[PDB]
Amino acid sequence: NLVAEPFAKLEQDFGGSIGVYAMDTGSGATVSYRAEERFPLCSSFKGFLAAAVLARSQQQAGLLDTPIRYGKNALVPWSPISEKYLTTGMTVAELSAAAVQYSDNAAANLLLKELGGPAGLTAFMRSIGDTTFRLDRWELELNSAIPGDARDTSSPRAVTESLQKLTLGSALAAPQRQQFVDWLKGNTTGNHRIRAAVPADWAVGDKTGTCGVYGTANDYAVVWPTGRAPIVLAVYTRAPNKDDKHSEAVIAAAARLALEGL
Ligand SMILES: *[B-](O)(O)[C@H](Cn1cc(C(=O)O)nn1)NC(=O)CSc1nnc(N)s1
C-alpha cells in the first residue's frame, strides 16, 4: 500500500498509531489509514454531543433558548466558560458553543445530562447509522485512554461518516445543521491541528480532543476548499505507554498527507 507508507513512517517516528480517514464529498475519493481501528474520543465527543442537542431541539420548542441556572457542583476542571458565567447561567445554545469551541467540561456534562447521559448520546449516534461510536463515561473519567479499552472510542472512518451526515447531509434539519457548522467554524482549540494543514483561504470547522496519556489526541473537521466540494476528515492518535506524549504536529502532518492524497 504505497499511499499508506508516509502514514506508517509518521506513526513510527511518533512512537504509536495514527488513524486517518478523509472523504472528498464531490468525487467520493478517500484516504484511509487504520481508518476502522478504535481510538479514544477524548473531548472530540463534544461535537457529536452538540449535534445530538440540536436534534433534540427540533422537537422541544425553545430548548436551545432555555437558560440553565447551574450551581458550582456542576463545575469540573477545565470549564473556563462555565465558571465565567456561573453567576449568570447559560442557555443550552451557549453551553453547546462552550463545549464545542472551548472544550468546556462542565458545559459538556450539563448537556449530557439533558440527553440521558453517555447512553443517550450513543443512542443518538446509532439513530444516524453510526454502529462504532460509544460513549460510556462523563468528563473527566472518559479520558483514561487505556490501550485495548473500547469505552469512549470510535474510529476515524465512523467519525468522518457521522460528521458528513450532520454537517452536510440531512441528519439534522437545515437550521440545526447550520448552527452545528457555525459552532465548529468558531472553534478556538484547533489552530495547531487540521487547521495548520489547510491553506489560509479555506474555511474550516473542527473539534479537538486530548486525553494526553498514552499519546492520545485527535481532531476532526469539515474543510471547504476554494472552488471545490467540501472535505470531511478525522485524525486520531494513540501510543502504548501511559507517559507517551501526544503531538499536535503529527496530527497536522497526517492531515497534510490526507489532503495531498485526495
Ligand atoms: B477532553 O475530554 O479532551 C478534556 C478537556 N480537553 C479538551 C481538549 C481539547 O479539545 O483538545 N483537551 N482537553 N480532557 C480532560 O479534561 C482531561 S485529559 C486532558 N485534559 N487536557 C489535556 N491537555 S489532556
Residue numbers in the entry: 27 to 57, 59 to 252, 254 to 290
Task: Show passages lifted from the paper.
MB_076 was designed to improve oxidation stability and hydrophobic interactions in the active site of serine class A β-lactamases, replacing the thiophene ring of S02030 with an amino-thiadiazole ring. A crystal structure of KPC-2 with MB_076 bound was solved at 1.38 Å resolution. The unbiased omit map contoured at 2.5 σ revealed density for MB_076 being covalently attached to the Oγ atom of the catalytic S70 residue. The two boronic acid hydroxyls of MB_076 form stabilizing interactions and occupy the oxyanion hole (formed by backbone N:H exchangers [NHEs] of S70 and T237) and the deacylation water pocket (formed by E166 and N170) of KPC-2. The carboxylate binding group of the MB_076 is situated in the β-lactam carboxyl binding pocket and forms hydrogen bonds in the active site with S130, T235, and T237. The C-H of the triazole ring is polar and can form a 3.0-Å C-H—O hydrogen bond interaction with the hydroxyl of S130. In accordance with our goal (to improve hydrophobic interactions by its thiophene ring) the CH2-S-thiadiazole ring-containing portion of MB_076 engages in hydrophobic interactions with N170, the main chain atoms of C238, and T237. Furthermore, the amino-thiadiazole ring forms intramolecular edge-to-face π-π interactions with the triazolyl moiety of MB_076.
The KPC β-lactamases present a larger and more ominous global threat. Boronic acid transition state inhibitors (BATSIs) are competitive, reversible BLIs that offer promise as novel therapeutic agents. Boronic acid transition state inhibitors (BATSIs) have the potential to become clinically important BLIs, which would add to the success of FDA-approved vaborbactam, as they possess a boron atom acting as an electrophile that mimics the carbonyl carbon of the β-lactam ring and forms a tetrahedral adduct with the catalytic serine that closely resembles the transition state in the hydrolytic mechanism. In this study, the activities of two α-amido-β-triazolylethaneboronic acid transition state inhibitors (S02030 and MB_076) targeting representative KPC (KPC-2) and CTX-M (CTX-M-96, a CTX-M-15-type extended-spectrum β-lactamase [ESBL]) β-lactamases were evaluated.
